Design a protein around this ligand. Structure first.
Ligand SMILES: CCC[C@]1(CC(=O)O)OCCc2c1[nH]c1c(Cl)ccc(Cl)c21
Ligand code: NA
Length: 559
């Protein structure tokens, strides 16, 4: 069937949309080529619609069915509990889209009578009505990028707040535990960046003659079929479930997950969806299981030997045994045709790689540096173009989500996050005296409230003390960073070092946690290095639940 059917009504914005980076002294000191930074808007929605609208092709075979059964057998060991209204309400982000039924996120979190009563009625409706399609709103997503040598806005589809709370009650436990039970070590969201690197490195080292490749599915969500979504439900149904949870899952699958009507911000009917909605609780878990299922079966069909998968939603990386250059190229081509038959066609044809560092997965690649002892240490990095473009935007315009904070946390060991992001934002936090102000950021889709002053402890816990002592980065990494700065008009690294010396001094002069930031985060900025010992409060932080599962689009807030 067609991924989407459109009426002609436009995908509309619910307010003015900013698309250009402002000329601001704060952002200008970080990035001068402001005209190269832009944010997507509803104005490009039609271009996106054209690309994601097509008739799907899908042919399942014995390999697919064999793998599905293997996955279901593992799912059969799971027991999901069903969340209480209170637990579900608490998982709701303070700024989550309000309901069109008289209440907002603040009301849900406060357990107001109106919110609770409506949520209970939505729940009962899921139990009684097993067929009526549930309404969803479609909007153009606002994301910042650097112009290319532009991308149209992505389309986000989500149901009302009441429904979102019910999804949590019926499926939060399932999507938080089933993926790992089913895919084991291949489930990417169970790893912190350091653990992801460890898995990739050990997997690569375990092969007699390693070959790897990332597989980019062309607009994955639109390739997900009704069959795929019911197969996904068949996996969830293997869990021991409370009766109402089982019915809720069955109803949500038929009324929301497999498709439904699309309404714009103006309340007009835009069309119908018959593929994955980006904004529902099961999107991350569902995409991961679907991608893992198709890829695992495709490897068998393609005759790729000993394939180890690492899946994060629609992002896939595969490491296997090489059978020779020509043989690998042919097998990969076969893999792709198998994926295509499973309705997982390629965006960019995959390419075999024989250098782990040359593989980009989850927009990242493994690279190497050295710790204080001079010992080699692998870490996760990525092209800094987007992170920098967004940091500039977030500097000139106050945004709900602070991607720069999430990037500092996830890429703390990198050359660019240390010399640029840390230096830039801590200097601004010092000037505005807001070091104590907690900010929101996202990690694997979930929203987290974090205090900048806790960064040292957070980083130590996630990356280890070596994150504060890495030096002698690779030639390729340095070159990539440096060329990126020239392209964006970002001052050269030498300038950032100079700026950091002053930031570090100011931090030390304030003592307390501020001084600890100066000592650990900016030890790279002083000639005579300080001996960095474990931070006491670091072994007391509760990072439980930080790297357990993915929730992109799941409307999840962690406290
Ligand atoms: C995180 C900074 C690391 C390190 C040391 C290193 O990489 O050996 O710390 C001192 C300043 C500095 C470093 N790397 C740099 C590079 Cl590639 C370019 C320019 C400068 Cl000015 C630096
Ligand atoms: Na893709």
């Amino acid at each position: 069937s067609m991924s989407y059917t459109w009426t002609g009504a436009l995908i509309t914005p619910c307010a003015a949309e900013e698309s250009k980076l402002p000329i601001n002294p704060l952002s200008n000191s970080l990035l001068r080529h402001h005209n190269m930074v832009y944010a997507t808007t509803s104005r490009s929605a039609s271009l996106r619609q054209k690309k994601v609208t097509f008739d799907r092709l899908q042919v399942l075979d014995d390999h697919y069915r064999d793998v599905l059964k293997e996955m279901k057998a593992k799912a059969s060991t799971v027991k999901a509990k069903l969340l209480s209204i209170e637990e579900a309400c608490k998982l709701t982000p303070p700024h989550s889209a309000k309901s069109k039924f008289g209440y907002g996120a603040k009301d849900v979190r406060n357990l107001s009578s109106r919110a609770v009563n409506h949520i209970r009625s939505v729940w009962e409706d899921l139990l009684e009505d097993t067929e009526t399609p549930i309404d969803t709103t479609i909007m153009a997503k606002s994301e910042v990028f650097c112009v290319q040598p532009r991308k149209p806005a992505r389309l986000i589809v989500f149901p009302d707040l009441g429904v979102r709370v019910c999804e949590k009650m019926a499926l939060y436990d399932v999507v938080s535990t089933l993926p790992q039970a089913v895919m084991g070590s291949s489930y990417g969201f169970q790893y912190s960046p350091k653990q992801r690197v460890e898995f990739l490195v050990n997997t690569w080292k375990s092969k007699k003659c390693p070959m790897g490749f990332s597989y980019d599915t062309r607009c994955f969500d639109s390739t997900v079929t009704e069959s795929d979504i019911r197969v996904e439900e068949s996996i969830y149904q293997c869990c021991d479930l409370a009766p109402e949870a089982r019915q809720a899952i069955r109803s949500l699958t038929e009324r929301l997950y497999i498709g439904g009507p699309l309404t714009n911000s103006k309340g007009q009917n835009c069309g119908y969806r018959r593929c994955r909605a980006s904004g529902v609780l099961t999107t991350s878990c569902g995409n991961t299981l679907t991608c893992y299922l198709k890829a695992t079966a495709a490897c068998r069909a393609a005759k790729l030997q000993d394939c180890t998968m690492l899946v994060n939603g629609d992002d896939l990386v595969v490491i296997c045994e090489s059978a020779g250059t020509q043989e690998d190229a042919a097998a990969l081509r076969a893999f792709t045709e198998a994926m295509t038959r499973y309705s997982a066609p390629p965006g960019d044809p995959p390419q075999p790689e024989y250098d782990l560092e040359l593989i980009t997965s989850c927009s990242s690649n493994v690279s190497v540096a050295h710790d204080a002892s001079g010992k080699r240490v692998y870490y996760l990095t990525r092209d800094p173009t987007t992170p920098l473009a967004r940091a500039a935007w977030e500097t000139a315009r106050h945004t709900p989500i602070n991607s720069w904070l999430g990037n500092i946390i996830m890429y703390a060991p990198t050359l660019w996050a240390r010399m640029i992001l840390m230096t830039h934002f801590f200097s601004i936090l010092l000037a505005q005296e807001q070091l104590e102000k907690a900010l929101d950021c996202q990690i694997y889709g979930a929203c987290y409230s974090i205090e900048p002053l806790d960064l040292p402890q957070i980083i130590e816990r996630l990356h280890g003390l070596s994150a504060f002592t890495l030096h002698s980065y690779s030639p390729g990494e340095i070159n990539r960073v440096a060329s990126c700065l020239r392209k964006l008009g970002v001052p050269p690294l030498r300038t950032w070092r100079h700026r950091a010396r002053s930031v570090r001094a100011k931090l030390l002069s304030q003592g307390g946690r501020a001084a600890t930031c100066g000592r650990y985060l900016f030890n790279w900025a002083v000639r005579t290095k300080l001996k960095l010992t474990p931070i006491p409060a670091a072994s007391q932080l509760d990072l439980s639940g930080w790297f357990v599962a993915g929730y992109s689009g799941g409307d999840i807030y962690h406290s």
